[PDB]
Design an enzyme around this catalytic site. Structure first.
Site, mmCIF file in Angstrom:
data_model
loop_
_atom_site.group_PDB
_atom_site.id
_atom_site.type_symbol
_atom_site.label_atom_id
_atom_site.label_comp_id
_atom_site.label_asym_id
_atom_site.label_seq_id
_atom_site.Cartn_x
_atom_site.Cartn_y
_atom_site.Cartn_z
ATOM 1 N N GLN A 19 0.794 -1.230 0.000
ATOM 2 C CA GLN A 19 0.000 0.000 0.000
ATOM 3 C C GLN A 19 0.831 1.288 0.000
ATOM 4 O O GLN A 19 0.311 2.384 -0.316
ATOM 5 C CB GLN A 19 -1.015 -0.001 1.143
ATOM 6 C CG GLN A 19 -0.439 0.135 2.454
ATOM 7 C CD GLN A 19 -1.464 -0.203 3.600
ATOM 8 O OE1 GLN A 19 -1.988 -1.316 3.731
ATOM 9 N NE2 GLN A 19 -1.680 0.762 4.437
ATOM 10 N N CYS A 25 -5.447 0.136 3.423
ATOM 11 C CA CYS A 25 -5.505 -1.263 3.848
ATOM 12 C C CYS A 25 -6.885 -1.893 3.541
ATOM 13 O O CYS A 25 -6.957 -3.056 3.097
ATOM 14 C CB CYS A 25 -5.203 -1.348 5.347
ATOM 15 S SG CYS A 25 -6.309 -0.334 6.369
ATOM 16 N N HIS A 162 -7.316 -1.978 11.099
ATOM 17 C CA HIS A 162 -6.608 -2.473 9.913
ATOM 18 C C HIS A 162 -7.409 -3.583 9.253
ATOM 19 O O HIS A 162 -8.067 -4.367 9.960
ATOM 20 C CB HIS A 162 -5.235 -2.961 10.377
ATOM 21 C CG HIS A 162 -4.289 -3.408 9.290
ATOM 22 N ND1 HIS A 162 -4.256 -2.840 8.038
ATOM 23 C CD2 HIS A 162 -3.341 -4.383 9.296
ATOM 24 C CE1 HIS A 162 -3.314 -3.447 7.325
ATOM 25 N NE2 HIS A 162 -2.709 -4.353 8.073
ATOM 26 N N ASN A 182 -0.825 -9.650 4.585
ATOM 27 C CA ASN A 182 -0.802 -8.233 4.824
ATOM 28 C C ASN A 182 -0.421 -7.503 3.509
ATOM 29 O O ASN A 182 -0.117 -8.145 2.509
ATOM 30 C CB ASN A 182 0.177 -7.919 5.937
ATOM 31 C CG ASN A 182 -0.062 -6.577 6.642
ATOM 32 O OD1 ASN A 182 -1.023 -5.836 6.408
ATOM 33 N ND2 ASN A 182 0.902 -6.249 7.551
HETATM 34 C C1 D1R Z 1 -5.183 0.865 7.066
HETATM 35 C C2 D1R Z 1 -4.412 0.386 8.294
HETATM 36 S S1 D1R Z 1 -2.697 0.612 8.209
HETATM 37 O O1 D1R Z 1 -2.168 -0.119 7.141
HETATM 38 O O2 D1R Z 1 -2.196 0.053 9.439
HETATM 39 C C3 D1R Z 1 -2.274 2.129 8.292
HETATM 40 C C4 D1R Z 1 -1.905 2.880 7.181
HETATM 41 C C5 D1R Z 1 -1.516 4.254 7.338
HETATM 42 C C6 D1R Z 1 -1.513 4.818 8.615
HETATM 43 C C7 D1R Z 1 -1.859 4.038 9.744
HETATM 44 C C8 D1R Z 1 -2.230 2.687 9.596
HETATM 45 C C9 D1R Z 1 -6.123 2.130 7.424
HETATM 46 C C10 D1R Z 1 -5.386 3.318 8.080
HETATM 47 C C11 D1R Z 1 -6.215 4.605 8.114
HETATM 48 C C12 D1R Z 1 -5.384 5.763 8.579
HETATM 49 C C13 D1R Z 1 -5.113 6.813 7.684
HETATM 50 C C14 D1R Z 1 -4.295 7.857 8.115
HETATM 51 C C15 D1R Z 1 -3.807 7.884 9.407
HETATM 52 C C16 D1R Z 1 -4.111 6.862 10.309
HETATM 53 C C17 D1R Z 1 -4.932 5.806 9.893
HETATM 54 N N1 D1R Z 1 -7.209 1.651 8.323
HETATM 55 C C18 D1R Z 1 -8.506 1.762 8.006
HETATM 56 O O3 D1R Z 1 -8.913 2.306 6.962
HETATM 57 C C19 D1R Z 1 -9.508 1.204 8.989
HETATM 58 C C20 D1R Z 1 -9.805 -0.243 8.510
HETATM 59 C C21 D1R Z 1 -10.923 -0.960 9.218
HETATM 60 C C22 D1R Z 1 -11.641 -1.893 8.519
HETATM 61 C C23 D1R Z 1 -12.685 -2.556 9.192
HETATM 62 C C24 D1R Z 1 -12.913 -2.306 10.516
HETATM 63 C C25 D1R Z 1 -12.170 -1.374 11.232
HETATM 64 C C26 D1R Z 1 -11.142 -0.690 10.560
HETATM 65 N N2 D1R Z 1 -10.749 1.984 8.941
HETATM 66 C C27 D1R Z 1 -10.914 2.922 9.882
HETATM 67 O O4 D1R Z 1 -10.038 3.039 10.782
HETATM 68 N N3 D1R Z 1 -12.036 3.672 9.843
HETATM 69 C C28 D1R Z 1 -13.094 3.428 8.857
HETATM 70 C C29 D1R Z 1 -13.573 4.711 8.185
HETATM 71 N N4 D1R Z 1 -13.618 5.828 9.107
HETATM 72 C C30 D1R Z 1 -14.501 6.931 8.771
HETATM 73 C C31 D1R Z 1 -12.728 6.003 10.250
HETATM 74 C C32 D1R Z 1 -12.351 4.676 10.864
#
Ligand code: D1R
Length: 215
Positions: A19, A25, A162, A182
């Site tokens: 990614q 993710c 995630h 992953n």
């Molecule tokens: C992917 C997880 S990651 O690869 O670990 C990652 C990537 C970049 C930064 C930190 C972690 C993403 C990360 C989102 C993020 C962007 C910017 C800064 C910090 C974090 N995680 C998500 O998109 C999660 C996935 C998910 C799926 C199903 C159930 C729970 C979580 N989605 C999420 O955190 N959401 C969903 C949409 N929303 C409005 C906020 C919360």
């Protein structure tokens, strides 16, 4: 359920992707699931487009985050069930840039009709995985950050943040484990994979399991 399954040995899993510097993710999770369900239905394995989701799914937030549930909803109800190939719509958001949706005359690689939510029950999940193919799951990724390999048995299990892909398990191991793909490149973990203990709800893995339905 059988003692062990690994969908990598059945042709249903594409190579490990990256990614990059984009919180996409949820898109990788969704696409990995559709890749596997499409192959298991009897079609050739084809790499499908995460970028389609990052750029075009208006329910989710591209690099800012998203949910697999929403992505499946968008595909079925906003894009007529269609998923474009990676070749037609390649991933460019690895540097964190999010271009506008292009959508015109893309190659369609797969089509889905619905999606389902699985019970919050590790044995039910194992059974469904054994019969149907790789599943989209959510985890708390806190303990993933320092992982290099082996079976993780003390995973922080407090908040889902995630989306990953569940590809198999082995109950004939002490301890039993799940196998997870992953999206942080093949240089992370066990050639891009992680094993977590099975049966103790490690990383809250049982909480938000879903899958596309093909046909
Ligand atoms: C992917 C997880 S990651 O690869 O670990 C990652 C990537 C970049 C930064 C930190 C972690 C993403 C990360 C989102 C993020 C962007 C910017 C800064 C910090 C974090 N995680 C998500 O998109 C999660 C996935 C998910 C799926 C199903 C159930 C729970 C979580 N989605 C999420 O955190 N959401 C969903 C949409 N929303 C409005 C906020 C919360």
């Amino acid at each position: 359920a059988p003692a062990a399954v690994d969908w990598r040995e059945k042709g249903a899993v594409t190579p490990v992707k990256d990614q990059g510097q984009c919180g996409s993710c949820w898109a990788f999770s969704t696409i990995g699931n559709i890749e596997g369900q499409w192959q298991v239905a009897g079609n050739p394995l084809v790499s499908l487009s995460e970028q389609m989701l990052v750029s075009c799914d208006t329910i989710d937030f591209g690099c800012g985050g998203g949910l697999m549930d929403n992505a499946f909803n968008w595909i079925v109800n906003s894009n007529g069930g269609n998923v474009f190939t990676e070749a037609s719509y390649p991933y460019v958001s690895g540097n964190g840039e999010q271009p506008q949706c292009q959508m015109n005359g893309h190659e369609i690689g797969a089509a889905i009709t619905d999606h389902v939510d699985l019970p919050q029950d590790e044995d039910a999940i194992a059974a469904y995985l054994a019969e149907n193919g790789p599943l989209a799951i959510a985890v708390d990724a806190t303990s993933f950050m320092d992982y290099n390999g082996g079976i993780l048995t003390s995973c922080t299990s407090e908040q889902l943040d995630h989306g990953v892909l569940l590809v198999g398990y082995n109950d004939a191991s002490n301890p039993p484990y799940w196998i997870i793909k992953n999206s942080w490149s093949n240089m992370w973990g066990e050639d891009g994979y992680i094993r977590i203990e099975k049966g103790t709800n490690q990383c809250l893995m049982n909480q938000a399991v879903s899958s596309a339905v093909v046909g």
